[PDB]
Amino acid sequence: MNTVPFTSAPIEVTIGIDQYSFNVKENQPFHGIKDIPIGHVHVIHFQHADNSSMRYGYWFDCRMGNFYIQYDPKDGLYKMMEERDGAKFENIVHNFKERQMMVSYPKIDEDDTWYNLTEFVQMDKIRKIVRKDENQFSYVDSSMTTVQENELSDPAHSLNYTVINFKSREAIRPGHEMEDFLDKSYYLNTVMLQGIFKNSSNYFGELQFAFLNAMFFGNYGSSLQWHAMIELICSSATVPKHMLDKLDEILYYQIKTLPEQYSDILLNERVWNICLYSSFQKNSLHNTEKIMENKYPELL
Amino acid sequence: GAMNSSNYAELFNNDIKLFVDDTNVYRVTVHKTFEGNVATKAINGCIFTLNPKTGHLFLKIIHTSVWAGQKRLSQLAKWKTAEEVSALVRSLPKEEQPKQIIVTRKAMLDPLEVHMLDFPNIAIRPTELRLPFSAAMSIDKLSDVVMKATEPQMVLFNIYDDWLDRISSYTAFSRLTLLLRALKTNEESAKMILLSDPTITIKSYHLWPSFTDEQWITIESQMRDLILTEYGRKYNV
């Protein structure tokens, strides 16, 4: 179990840690989060009380260094930083734990929710989508645009997701125009899986990261990317059986975790109805289709 | 975006463009089988690709052999149409290629967009006009060449005959659409109107009869009466 020490909490803020969240009042004596499960990536995120504009946060993996949060009154946000002096850090944390100034990561022991939402997500791949190589953690917020959005403006502050575009020369082989547009197996299996992602795990990892940024930051570009990657699989007639079985699980847990009230903006009606009811894979996502129909039958 | 009554004059400017109509690509007769089931027998079709400014018509005859052994023919027809249009652009010199292609049915947008990815600077557009290009097979000389074809074939026509020598392309297109709308609403009456007077003939190198300006006004007036008529006979008014 690891710990993320907060210098202090000078401004009132809702703090997120993975799928959990709690309120901290202005200048409350809050010094961070403890008992964070090792072995998973995590995201610690923020919405100021005074300006719900700009949700922002940090993706991190405690095995990659000692990280702490300190408010910056110039830039006006809670900033993640790395402490290289390991002894200084253990010493700082032990004081705050003895004085019980930390919230505990509240993992119920039956609860695999966070594992099931980050199974394929790896920090090294996150750092390639979010380019800022001087830090081992990755900053994301609501307003960051994706590389493909910038094509349709600051590249340093972009989300460099894999560009997917069904009406592109990459997606469509000369002479197989109809075949490749109505059955995207070539684009999924040869172009994306064999070509770009190398395997299904890296594909699912980006998909899972896209969902999480959409849900936690309301990042519209991430939501576009999540849906594109689902549709590409659902629109492929030929998909390994293990990827379909995993996709069904991945999505099930994403739909299970989505806030009931945010369904209207995070779920694309066309994609979901197509995937579940029209696509080649309409009969292959039993778990996902059952939770969608019982929880969001309006959308369908 | 789409093409409607508000940007109608764009058709007759000096940016090369083509209308594509796919309504006569896949044509069937429906009939009973000996067992009393129903089956279709395809007949030759055509792609109607028309430069509205010049009257140049690129009539791609679709021979029924292109359907042999194929499934979902209504869907293949759209893609076959897109393939042939794309091959036509590719066959034209760069300075003859269209800057826009307007499809008369929205189901053609994606098939043509995909076949034209190599031409990112060619705009593929729908239209809100109800154009009567389906009645192209009521033009006897076009119908004849489609039905006689024993293999795939492209035939070139000028659908305005020699009219541009005397009228503008706006006016030429408005005459064409009035004739086609009439032929679509009552083919027999429309054809009667056009050929009642045997002194006015169709030149061997033309599609429509050799009418004087005055005879065209009379003709045009009769076609309107016919269209208004059938509209009453249809709705009782």
Ligand SMILES: O=[N+]([O-])c1cc(Cl)ccc1NCCO
């Ligand atoms: O070192 N630390 O671990 C650390 C934690 C907290 Cl909560 C505040 C400040 C620091 N370091 C200040 C930079 O020398």
